[PDB]
Amino acid sequence: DDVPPYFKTEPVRTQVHLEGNRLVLTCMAEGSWPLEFKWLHNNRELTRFSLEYRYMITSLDRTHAGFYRCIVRNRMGALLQRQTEVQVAYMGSFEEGEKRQSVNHGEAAVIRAPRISSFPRPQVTWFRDGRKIPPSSRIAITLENTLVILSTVAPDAGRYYVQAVNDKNGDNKTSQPITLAVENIAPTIIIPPKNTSVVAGTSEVTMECVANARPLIKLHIVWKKDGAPLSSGISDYNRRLTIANPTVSDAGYYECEAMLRSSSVAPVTRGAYLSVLEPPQFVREPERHITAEMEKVVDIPCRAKGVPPPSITWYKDAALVEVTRFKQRSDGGLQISGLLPDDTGMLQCFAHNAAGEAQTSTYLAVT
Amino acid sequence: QDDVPPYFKTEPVRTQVHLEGNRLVLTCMAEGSWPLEFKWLHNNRELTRFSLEYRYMITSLDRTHAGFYRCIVRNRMGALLQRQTEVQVAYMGSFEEGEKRQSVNHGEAAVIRAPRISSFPRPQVTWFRDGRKIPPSSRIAITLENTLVILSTVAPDAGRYYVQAVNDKNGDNKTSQPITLAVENVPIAPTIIIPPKNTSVVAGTSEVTMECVANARPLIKLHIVWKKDGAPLSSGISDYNRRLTIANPTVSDAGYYECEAMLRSSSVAPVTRGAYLSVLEPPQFVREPERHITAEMEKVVDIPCRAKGVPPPSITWYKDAALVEVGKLTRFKQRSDGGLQISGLLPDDTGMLQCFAHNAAGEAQTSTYLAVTS
Ligand SMILES: *[C@@H]1O[C@H](CO[C@@H]2O[C@@H](C)[C@@H](O)[C@@H](O)[C@@H]2O)[C@@H](O[C@@H]2O[C@H](CO)[C@@H](O)[C@H](O)[C@H]2NC(C)=O)[C@H](O)[C@H]1NC(C)=O
Ligand SMILES: *[C@@H]1O[C@H](CO[C@@H]2O[C@@H](C)[C@@H](O)[C@@H](O)[C@@H]2O)[C@@H](O)[C@H](O)[C@H]1NC(C)=O
Ligand SMILES: *[C@@H]1O[C@H](CO)[C@@H](O)[C@H](O)[C@H]1NC(C)=O
Ligand SMILES: *[C@@H]1O[C@H](CO)[C@@H](O)[C@H](O)[C@H]1NC(C)=O
């Protein structure tokens, strides 16, 4: 008939799956006959148009990971689906071989964990000569799984290796030993806070600061958000700052201040920005159906807000609009001047972020 | 180091959706001294006995496997309760009901609820009249509950109505038995057929939708205005102004949302119906106990635990993965703030103490090892 395509629902932005498990992607669109469907992987065609609204993978492997989206069409026009990221849980082997490292006695030893390919990042247990190494006042283990001995002693010498476990599929692999040799002061920050981005509602995000001082027992780490002292979410010998349920208000400059108690010496601070992200949301949208006369000018509205502020891209029947008779306003609205009857079809406005994308559509009829 | 108390390196996701027939691997990512053993629970019922296996694996998921899973980790020092995960299984049953008959007066509203079908998640539903798709329109509304509402019936509305229901997670596609509608010949003020319902959502869900289906004669002059706490809204409104969708809901987005149905250019008074939007945030700890607590025998120790969230979180204490008796005539008392007070410390009070703050939006936990000296 004459019902333009439209989506009944949108897919989740991200989805994690096990290797060997089945994946079923759906294009939940409605519209007039014949409603046909085309699938894309990383914006590259997987299928040709058909009445099949599903894309099914019987047994997932790593090569299947990526962004999927469908294109729905009929006689009226075509729409680009909001894309979903399919992530496949896997774990490779430990690549590196045995290695050697040397540190001076009483100084900090920084031993980075051997690289292993894995999604998600694996949980890592450190071993010294077959014995587990839990965190302590002089032993720090970073979010990057880096081992940091704050003040080395002779019996620190030995063979260090990691056990890495993938929490999603339960894969468990052990690396080759790293031999540490121990060879015969104001507060310093060894592992500074890194810039961290997170989407609102992620439930947890952690900043980290590993500090060192002589004497070590007098070392005290103070956490601040935009200069304001923090007193919650702090753990792991004051090296981790964790924000539960982060919101855009939880964004800002988080600094780690390393100081010595009962000491005159000045503290040292290192800081990083926490970016809490909100996916795009439309403020103004075009009407479902727009009618306009030939050779005339039509203004099609599209405003969106998000954190960071969303960029706006227009599509005509699942294809990119070149902005010519087409102009895009600063607000993001589309202006089509000198309307031709062949400008008839589905126009789509995509508001995209680092946190995700949103879409709104309309059917333009040129009389 | 045979005396390192158990602790979790990470926690499982609060909710996870899986397909029938797919394999599930649950992990208890805990560290600690030997022997580190693991026990698994389904809806707080034991699945296994303690063992060195940190994984629980289901080869082929079905509907019965859905529910809450959590592990208990232990060693010589004590035991910790894992934060539990909800495993949800995507499925779809058959349409239970058979053919049915319905009657409406001409020019009046027809409300046809969709035939019940067992499915997770809720299926997307397309309505058909005599083999023809029924898209929403000025007189045709389709609710979030998949109910079909004809605002002003006419003679050719009579016929057989059925639904096509598709499960967007596994792509299952089933069709119901027809519902026969009869239109019987036997100026209507603006009324609200489907009023806004009380709706709850967790912050960061990215979308939550209120709905209001209104009816009036004439329908052409009918206009729906959406307001939050009395202030008219101009964004997130769609589906002929029947849907109000809030993207990226925050605690600030909570309040009283009312649907106002009015007739443009008309003497008649408008009608207003409203509901509450509850935006929820899972519990977050304000004050926590330290990693290790040492205390002298026969003395009193105060172990702190304060948490904030919406709704206000209730607080529950555990001693070695078992519920702590805070009831009267015990040595264990819970402060109003949520802190635990242990008076007359006995050497068997040594072990892992855990504080669980739980909401409707989820739970949070913090632990400590209590060592009682002398
Ligand atoms: C971390 O990133 C900042 C910039 O991040 C953005 O700007 C902030 C003001 C805040 O709005 C964040 O949420 C944004 O994501 C880096 O800041 C730069 O610093 C260099 C010198 O250090 C300066 O020349 C640049 O102008 C700054 N801005 C940019 C955009 O580069 C900062 O260096 C990063 N690293 C840290 C803090 O360790
Ligand atoms: C809906 O719920 C009402 C009470 O809801 C609670 O109180 C308000 C003030 C909000 O804070 C809300 O988040 C709470 O859950 C009931 O009074 C009412 O009967 C319920 N039903 C309807 C149809 O309104
Ligand atoms: C992981 O595998 C190693 C074998 O290399 C084994 O010693 C260790 O116990 C395993 N981890 C477990 C079972 O948690
Ligand atoms: C769903 O099943 C019905 C019933 O056979 C069929 O008519 C329809 O085409 C199916 N939908 C598809 C294949 O997308």
Numbering used by the authors:
A (entry chain B): 2 to 185, 193 to 331, 335 to 378
B (entry chain A): 1 to 186, 192 to 379
Please quote the authors directly:
Sdk1 and Sdk2 are single-pass transmembrane proteins, with extracellular regions composed of 6 N-terminal immunoglobulin (Ig) domains followed by 13 fibronectin type III (FNIII) domains, and a relatively short intracellular domain terminating in a Postsynaptic density/Discs Large/ZO-1 (PDZ) binding motif. Here, we report the crystal structures of cell-cell adhesive homophilic dimers of mouse Sdk1 and Sdk2, each mediated by the four N-terminal Ig domains. These four domains adopt a horseshoe conformation, like many other IgSF cell-cell recognition proteins, but they interact in a unique back-to-back anti-parallel manner not previously observed. Overall, our data suggest a model in which Sdks form cis dimers on isolated cell surfaces, which dissociate to form trans dimers through the same interface when contact is made to a cell surface expressing the cognate Sdk.
Two crystal forms of Sdk1Ig1–4 were determined at 2.2 and 3.2 Å resolution respectively, one of Sdk1Ig1–5 at 3.5 Å, two of Sdk2Ig1–4 at 2.7 and 3.2 Å respectively, and one of the Sdk2Ig1–2/Sdk1Ig3–4 chimera at 2.7 Å resolution. Although the Ig1–2:Ig1–2 interaction is present in all of the crystal forms of Sdk1 and Sdk2, there is a difference in rotational angle between the two horseshoes of the dimer among the crystal forms, with the Ig1–2:Ig1–2 interface acting as the hinge. The Ig3–4:Ig3–4 interaction varies from the Ig3–4 domains forming a considerable additional interface—as in Sdk1Ig1–4 crystal form 2 (915 Å2 BSA) and Sdk2Ig1–4 crystal form 1 (1294 Å2 BSA)—to being splayed 14 Å apart, as in the Sdk1Ig1–4 crystal form 1 structure (0 Å2 BSA). Analysis of the Ig3–4:Ig3–4 interface regions in the Sdk1Ig1–4 crystal form 2 and Sdk2Ig1–4 crystal form 1 structures, which show the most extensive Ig3–4:Ig3–4 contacts, reveals predominantly hydrophilic surfaces with hydrogen bonds between N253Ig3 and P287Ig4 in both structures, S240 Ig3 and T291Ig4 in Sdk1, and T255Ig3 and E286Ig4 in Sdk2. However, there are three Ig3–4:Ig3–4 interfacial residues that show non-conservative differences between Sdk1 and Sdk2 that are mostly conserved amongst vertebrate orthologs (H/S243Ig3, Y/Q289Ig4 and S/R296Ig4). These differences result in the Sdk2 interface containing a π-stacking interaction between Y245Ig3 and R296Ig4, which is absent from Sdk1. Mutagenesis of a key Ig3–4:Ig3–4 interface residue (N253E) did not prevent Sdk dimerization, although it did reduce the dimer affinity, particularly for Sdk2, which went from 2.2 μM to 18.9 μM, implying a small Ig3–4 contribution to dimer strength of around 1.3 kcal/mol. In addition to these major interfacial regions, the Sdk1Ig1–4 crystal form 2 also shows a small contact region between Ig1 residues E11 and R83 and Ig3 residue E212 towards the center of the horseshoe dimer. This interaction is not seen in either of the Sdk2 structures, although the residues are conserved.
